Write a protein that binds this ligand. Structure first.
Ligand SMILES: CN[C@@H]1[C@@H](O[C@H]2O[C@H](CO)[C@@H](N)[C@H](O)[C@H]2O)O[C@H]2C[C@@H](N)[C@@H](O[C@H]3[C@H](O)[C@@H](O)[C@H](N)C[C@@H]3N)O[C@@H]2[C@@H]1O
Ligand SMILES: [K+]
Ligand SMILES: [K+]
Ligand SMILES: [K+]
Ligand SMILES: [K+]
Ligand SMILES: [K+]
Ligand SMILES: [K+]
Ligand SMILES: [K+]
Ligand SMILES: [K+]
Ligand SMILES: [K+]
Ligand SMILES: [K+]
Ligand SMILES: [K+]
Ligand SMILES: [Mg+2]
Ligand SMILES: [Mg+2]
Ligand SMILES: [Mg+2]
Ligand SMILES: [Mg+2]
Ligand SMILES: [Mg+2]
Ligand SMILES: [Mg+2]
Ligand SMILES: [Mg+2]
Ligand SMILES: [Mg+2]
Ligand SMILES: [Mg+2]
Ligand SMILES: [Mg+2]
Ligand SMILES: [Mg+2]
Ligand SMILES: [Mg+2]
Ligand SMILES: [Mg+2]
Ligand SMILES: [Mg+2]
Ligand SMILES: [Mg+2]
Ligand SMILES: [Mg+2]
Ligand SMILES: [Mg+2]
Ligand SMILES: [Mg+2]
Ligand SMILES: [Mg+2]
Ligand SMILES: [Mg+2]
Ligand SMILES: [Mg+2]
Ligand SMILES: [Mg+2]
Ligand SMILES: [Mg+2]
Ligand SMILES: [Mg+2]
Ligand SMILES: [Mg+2]
Ligand SMILES: [Mg+2]
Ligand SMILES: [Mg+2]
Ligand SMILES: [Mg+2]
Ligand SMILES: [Mg+2]
Ligand SMILES: [Mg+2]
Ligand SMILES: [Mg+2]
Ligand SMILES: [Mg+2]
Ligand SMILES: [Mg+2]
Ligand SMILES: [Mg+2]
Ligand SMILES: [Mg+2]
Ligand SMILES: [Mg+2]
Ligand SMILES: [Mg+2]
Ligand SMILES: [Mg+2]
Ligand SMILES: [Mg+2]
Ligand SMILES: [Mg+2]
Ligand SMILES: [Mg+2]
Ligand SMILES: [Mg+2]
Ligand SMILES: [Mg+2]
Ligand SMILES: [Mg+2]
Ligand SMILES: [Mg+2]
Ligand SMILES: [Mg+2]
Ligand SMILES: [Mg+2]
Ligand SMILES: [Mg+2]
Ligand SMILES: [Mg+2]
Ligand SMILES: [Mg+2]
Ligand SMILES: [Mg+2]
Ligand SMILES: [Mg+2]
Ligand SMILES: [Mg+2]
Ligand SMILES: [Mg+2]
Ligand SMILES: [Mg+2]
Ligand SMILES: [Mg+2]
Ligand SMILES: [Mg+2]
Ligand SMILES: [Mg+2]
Ligand SMILES: [Mg+2]
Ligand SMILES: [Mg+2]
Ligand SMILES: [Mg+2]
Ligand SMILES: [Mg+2]
Ligand SMILES: [Mg+2]
Ligand SMILES: [Mg+2]
Ligand SMILES: [Mg+2]
Ligand SMILES: [Mg+2]
Ligand SMILES: [Mg+2]
Ligand SMILES: [Mg+2]
Ligand SMILES: [Mg+2]
Ligand SMILES: [Mg+2]
Ligand SMILES: [Mg+2]
Ligand SMILES: [Mg+2]
Ligand SMILES: [Mg+2]
Ligand SMILES: [Mg+2]
Ligand SMILES: [Mg+2]
Ligand SMILES: [Mg+2]
Ligand SMILES: [Mg+2]
Ligand SMILES: [Zn+2]
Lengths: 83, 124, 138, 208, 104, 99
RNA sequence: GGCUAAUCCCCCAUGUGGACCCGCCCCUUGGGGUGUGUCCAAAGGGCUUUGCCCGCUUCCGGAUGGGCCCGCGUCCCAUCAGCUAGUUGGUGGGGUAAUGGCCCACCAAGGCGACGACGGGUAGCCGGUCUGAGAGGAUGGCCGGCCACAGGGGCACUGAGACACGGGCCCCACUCCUACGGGAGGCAGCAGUUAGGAAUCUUCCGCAAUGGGCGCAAGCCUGACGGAGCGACGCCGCUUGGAGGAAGAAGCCCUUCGGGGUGUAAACUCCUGAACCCGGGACGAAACCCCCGACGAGGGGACUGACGGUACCGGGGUAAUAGCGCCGGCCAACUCCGUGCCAGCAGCCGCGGUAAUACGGAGGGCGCGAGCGUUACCCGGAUUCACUGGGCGUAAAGGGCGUGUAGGCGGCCUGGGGCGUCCCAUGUGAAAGACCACGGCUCAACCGUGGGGGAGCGUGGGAUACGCUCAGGCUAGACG
RNA sequence: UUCAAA
């Protein structure tokens, strides 16, 4: 059961995540199947949250169960806007 | 040698023979004393250099040199060894770290006091 | 036997020049000839003729030196102050196109053999190819 | 803490008058002024032909004392400059220069560098706004180095800055005595400096 | 791509099997001089067809027995027993180099 | 102490038991079917076999045999039974066998 | 021993479909399809109640993960040269998800080795890390990927998965309860204890963030984790003041007793204010949930911070720790005294036997600075194992001399092949790292984002000079 | 005899 989630690549008091596709059984920060975005929980930069929308909309088409927070960020970037 | 030979034989690596096998190459090693005599230097020198047969925790019994001008080492005094040839008196390949264990630091030493383990004179 | 034919010629050349001879012959081998074409075209040897000594195909090579000099030792300067064999049998030297040596900041050549023929370093780097690094010269 | 002790003493160990005190190091009394020989009870004695190393060792110390920097700091910069693209010798120079504690003195807000340092470490300086207490802090081209509003009105800044009016500055620096602003235009070229040092040697000292 | 190698049958004494010796030329990693190095594989001869001496193309196959993961794909050239010689003679060479010398 | 993951050990034992049984049953009829086919009694040779094909498949239903394991067992059985009735046989009952 | 429920177990049925034997097609190792025969399905629970939700069953495919197999690469000893009966292969068979001597029965003589078998020794491998001009050498802690083990040695059970670290059984050692019949137990999980050692931490806070398990959800569990704590162990930033100030206090040292040093150093004048005090005080946290919409997109609102009253901001505000090494040459830095081959120094060459720039103290000087030294180990310098890049007449180094086995190496010319060699295209080269450029913490260290390369190997296509091989010819080598 | 010392 593969999941779209966050992998903390920050530092002490300087978190930075990487939205990723990966088998839920791997360790949080281990080898992943693919990176599809990166969120900066503190907006230290004008561009604190980007996310490949195509790849996302794809891994979802086959399972990639997004954790709650993973989903939120994917959402807040129109992964789910179906206009 | 011909190239073929090298391909056949090949060059040989040179291993380094340690000068301080008082084990584990550990920076230091401690031991208890046994004999604490004095010895005469090799030519062209003279004096009564202070030595000591030490029984190490590495199972060895080697003779370590006691630096400084005065010591308080007797029969079963425990002490820390540290390697360092003593050019003259052969057979001696290690030094006694002073200021550690029953090996007090030299007194009134004011210069290279870091060695010989003497605290800093409080200076009035 | 004659262990390495080319390495032989490059020497017969080297030697013949240190004594400052007019020419010097060598056994005839096409590959040797092709090598000469390069030495010829580069201003290392005035050229080579196909003379037949004793009724055996040879290659008279005409050597070129410099001009007489001043002070002690008036001996001319060599045009070929160096010609060293590289890929020799029992250790062949093969180079890719991006590993073809710049012989002395370009003042020398490097006759190497490619499947596009026998060319100099520049020539084959131009044609973009590699091969058996026959030798160097400068 | 960067050194901190007898200064108009090194002045006279490098045989060159390192204006390390600003005024007094400028006017008759820099110590180098009447006592050029080295310190200690052996200074006046003749000197022995310095060794190839001996020399590069001084030629470095000279350059390093000029900026009052620590070896620890000096090394990094040099190693960084050795990596950076271009003639390492100058790039090293124009980098020592880009130091706030230096550009500050170069702009004049302070007389010497030791004083120029204290100004920064006490918050008396601003880079494009926002305070900065990092003497080392890199000053990039275009950055404006002014004096904190809350300190523009200070007993020292006055005299030092008043003393400017008229006095010009490097073909890379530009002032504004008015509000006490200043701008880092260009990174000084080897040419723009009049350093009594042959950087070429300090290279050859680490190239050791 | 299932690895296909070319070699020479040097043993047919096995049932439905053959020892195939395969050579591989190449520049030596440190001294350059190109060197020959060989390895033999035990190939599968389903209908005891290929006989000693033949030159065959061995192909990466599914396990047949411990040490024997290759089947004989086809025959390139036939019975050149000259190659088998270089081999048998070498092994026969081993005869010496022992405890009480041997023979040349 | 205690780990109420003992309920697991507890359970395996209870399962281990159920499986062991279904298996023994399969093996027994298999043998019993081959016995008759290898005696030319094509009558209850198939009947018992056909009645073991199910025992096998069924065992596979849950988690006893599962998959290819049951497949194999059946293959192995129908094979023996066919070629063993090669002694005047003639699959009378038809049973799990395309005659 | 007795009673009992279910999504527990079982029988029958329906069967989209799937499983098996045989026959036949297509494919080509056991792939797919057919036609007879046979075989196999399933819980139910919740409700905002004949409608939805969470589940169940048989398939097919996807996605993720994993078995197995193969080419090539991966340490020392030849004072380890022979090794081998499940050994090598076969035919059936058992076992498994699956090939296989994986195991068994029977059969056959075979398999491996100087291209180093076998035996002995050492070792978890790798991305990378250190060093180096490179080639190369040395390493594999932390982080990431494989692997193996869970007191030692065997086993199988359950299960999609294990032969299970905190599951089971047995044997051995040990520890603890025992009524001496028997029992209980595995920190190489986080802390911590003790032992060994030159040496390596708090029996901490929290589930707020990210991640994992179960659950419709609320929520529960999480020593994974996020934070604190101790340690100059390492890297980076920072303070111990700044500007004045005597032809130059005193005290110290030197002195041809004129004078010279420490010294602009201090005293002292002014200046800024680490520390400390007052007040404010956060990012990291917006989802899950709830309502509107349709349990969807979309909108709305409520919870929620260990770190921490900390970082940071505003105001006030004292002048506010420096050491350690060294000074004969290499090697940056000298003099006085005390010692008298003594005491001692010493990385190498070397110092001390009555004037010591080398011992010990002092003044002075050099180096670096919250560090400075010593010891141990790795690379370099060391072209001092020389591939790049050495040698062997006399320095170490030509075998006493042949014959010839393996092997290495092969003259001139022409064809074919295309193994070596070369070229283009392409796949791969994970992330981290290194390099470049931007960007975030006031800099930096640290961190983020993007980018360019790269050896090696796979695949498709091409070249043929040189090497290789096949097939002819030659006479200059060799033999007659 | 020892160790130096030009
Ligand atoms: C109040 N705890 C202190 C901490 O405070 C700082 O970080 C905290 C992080 O939560 C903040 N809450 C706090 O406000 C802030 O001021 O700073 C560290 C700095 C670290 N080099 C070490 O220094 C020690 C040295 O390592 C040691 O050698 C010396 N003897 C004593 C020093 N304190 O230990 C202290 C100590 O852990
Ligand atoms: K043998
Ligand atoms: K009961
Ligand atoms: K499936
Ligand atoms: K696989
Ligand atoms: K078999
Ligand atoms: K290694
Ligand atoms: K005296
Ligand atoms: K002294
Ligand atoms: K070394
Ligand atoms: K000899
Ligand atoms: K002999
Ligand atoms: Mg030791
Ligand atoms: Mg002496
Ligand atoms: Mg030593
Ligand atoms: Mg030459
Ligand atoms: Mg070469
Ligand atoms: Mg540079
Ligand atoms: Mg077989
Ligand atoms: Mg349970
Ligand atoms: Mg029975
Ligand atoms: Mg009962
Ligand atoms: Mg049906
Ligand atoms: Mg059907
Ligand atoms: Mg079929
Ligand atoms: Mg049924
Ligand atoms: Mg039913
Ligand atoms: Mg059931
Ligand atoms: Mg076996
Ligand atoms: Mg099978
Ligand atoms: Mg079989
Ligand atoms: Mg081990
Ligand atoms: Mg080198
Ligand atoms: Mg490596
Ligand atoms: Mg560890
Ligand atoms: Mg690891
Ligand atoms: Mg074990
Ligand atoms: Mg243990
Ligand atoms: Mg056990
Ligand atoms: Mg065990
Ligand atoms: Mg399960
Ligand atoms: Mg099972
Ligand atoms: Mg377990
Ligand atoms: Mg177990
Ligand atoms: Mg295991
Ligand atoms: Mg445990
Ligand atoms: Mg523990
Ligand atoms: Mg202890
Ligand atoms: Mg810790
Ligand atoms: Mg949590
Ligand atoms: Mg969670
Ligand atoms: Mg609990
Ligand atoms: Mg807790
Ligand atoms: Mg942690
Ligand atoms: Mg002052
Ligand atoms: Mg004040
Ligand atoms: Mg918040
Ligand atoms: Mg927020
Ligand atoms: Mg919650
Ligand atoms: Mg509604
Ligand atoms: Mg919403
Ligand atoms: Mg000197
Ligand atoms: Mg000393
Ligand atoms: Mg005497
Ligand atoms: Mg005397
Ligand atoms: Mg000295
Ligand atoms: Mg520091
Ligand atoms: Mg070397
Ligand atoms: Mg060489
Ligand atoms: Mg070499
Ligand atoms: Mg030599
Ligand atoms: Mg001799
Ligand atoms: Mg000799
Ligand atoms: Mg001889
Ligand atoms: Mg021969
Ligand atoms: Mg031969
Ligand atoms: Mg040839
Ligand atoms: Mg040949
Ligand atoms: Mg040819
Ligand atoms: Mg080819
Ligand atoms: Mg590639
Ligand atoms: Mg990477
Ligand atoms: Mg920046
Ligand atoms: Mg990057
Ligand atoms: Mg040709
Ligand atoms: Mg011929
Ligand atoms: Mg006598
Ligand atoms: Mg003497
Ligand atoms: Mg003399
Ligand atoms: Zn001065």
């Amino acid at each position: 059961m593969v999941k779209i989630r966050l992998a903390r690549f920050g530092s002490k008091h300087n978190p930075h995540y990487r939205i990723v596709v990966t088998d839920a059984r791997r360790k949080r920060d281990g080898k992943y199947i693919e990176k599809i975005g990166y969120y900066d929980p503190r907006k230290t930069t004008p561009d604190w949250l980007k996310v490949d929308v195509e790849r996302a909309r794809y891994w979802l088409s086959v399972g990639a169960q997004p954790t709650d927070t993973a989903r939120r960020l994917l959402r807040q970037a129109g992964v789910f806007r179906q206009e | 040698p011909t190239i073929n030979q090298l391909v056949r034989k090949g060059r040989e690596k040179v291993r380094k023979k340690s000068k301080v096998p008082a084990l584990k190459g550990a920076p230091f090693r401690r031991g208890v004393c046994t004999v604490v005599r004095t010895v005469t230097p090799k030519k062209p020198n003279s004096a009564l250099r202070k030595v000591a047969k030490v029984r190490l925790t590495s199972g060895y019994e080697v003779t370590a040199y006691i630096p400084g001008e005065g010591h308080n080492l007797q029969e079963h005094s425990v002490v820390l060894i540290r390697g360092g040839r003593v050019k003259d008196l052969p057979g001696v390949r290690y030094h006694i770290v002073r200021g550690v264990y029953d090996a007090a630091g030299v007194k009134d030493r004011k210069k290279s006091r870091s060695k010989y383990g003497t605290k800093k004179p409080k200076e009035a | 036997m004659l262990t390495d034919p080319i390495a032989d010629m490059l020497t017969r050349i080297r030697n013949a020049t240190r004594v400052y001879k007019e020419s010097t012959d060598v056994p005839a081998s096409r590959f040797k000839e092709e090598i000469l074409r390069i030495l010829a075209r580069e201003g290392f040897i005035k050229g080579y003729e196909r003379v037949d000594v004793d009724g055996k195909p040879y290659l008279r090579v005409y050597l070129k030196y410099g001009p007489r000099r001043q002070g002690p030792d008036p001996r001319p300067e060599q045009v070929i102050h160096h010609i060293r064999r590289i890929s020799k049998p029992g250790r062949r030297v093969y180079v890719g196109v991006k590993e073809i040596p710049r012989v002395r900041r370009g003042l020398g050549i490097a006759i190497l053999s490619t499947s596009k023929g026998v060319l100099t370093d520049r020539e084959a780097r131009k044609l973009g190819v590699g091969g058996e690094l026959i030798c160097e010269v400068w | 803490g960067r050194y901190i002790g007898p200064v108009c003493r090194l002045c006279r160990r490098e045989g060159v008058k390192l204006y390390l005190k600003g005024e007094r190091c400028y006017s008759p009394k820099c110590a180098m002024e009447r006592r050029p020989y080295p310190p200690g009870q052996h200074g006046q004695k003749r000197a022995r032909r310095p060794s190839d190393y001996a020399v590069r060792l001084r030629e470095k110390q000279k350059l390093r004392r000029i900026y009052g920097i620590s070896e620890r700091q000096f090394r990094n910069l040099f190693e960084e400059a050795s990596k950076k693209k271009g003639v390492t010798g100058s790039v090293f120079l124009g980098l020592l220069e880009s130091r706030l504690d230096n550009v500050v003195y170069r702009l004049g807000f302070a007389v010497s560098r030791r004083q120029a340092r204290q100004l920064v470490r006490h918050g008396h300086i601003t880079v494009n706004g926002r305070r900065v207490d990092l003497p080392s802090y890199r000053v990039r081209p275009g950055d404006e180095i002014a004096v904190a509003e809350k300190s523009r009105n200070l007993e020292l800044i006055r005299q030092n800055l008043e003393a400017m009016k008229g006095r010009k500055v490097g073909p890379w620096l530009s002032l504004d005595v008015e509000g006490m602003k200043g701008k880092f235009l260009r990174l000084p070229d080897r040419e723009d400096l009049a350093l009594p040092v042959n950087e070429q040697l300090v290279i050859e000292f680490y190239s050791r | 791509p299932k690895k296909v190698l070319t070699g020479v049958v040097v043993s047919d004494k096995m049932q439905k099997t053959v020892t195939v010796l395969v050579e591989r030329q190449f520049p030596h990693p440190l001294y350059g001089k190109v060197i020959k190095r060989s390895k033999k594989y035990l190939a599968h001869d389903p209908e005891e067809k290929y006989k000693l001496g033949d030159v065959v193309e061995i192909i990466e196959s599914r396990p047949i027995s411990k040490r024997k993961r290759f089947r004989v794909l086809r025959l390139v050239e036939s019975g050149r027993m000259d190659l088998v010689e270089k081999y048998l003679i070498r092994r026969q060479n081993y005869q010496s180099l022992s405890k009480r010398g041997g023979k040349a | 102490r205690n780990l109420s993951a003992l309920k697991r050990h507890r359970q395996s034992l209870k399962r281990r038991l159920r499986n062991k049984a279904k298996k023994s049953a399969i093996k027994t009829l298999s043998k019993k079917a081959v016995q008759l086919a290898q005696e030319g009694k094509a009558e209850e040779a198939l009947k018992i076999m056909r009645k073991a094909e199910s025992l096998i498949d069924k065992a596979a239903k849950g988690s006893t045999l599962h998959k290819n394991a049951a497949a194999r067992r059946k293959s192995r059985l129908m094979r023996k039974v066919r070629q063993l009735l090669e002694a005047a046989g003639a699959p009378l009952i038809g049973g799990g066998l395309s005659a």
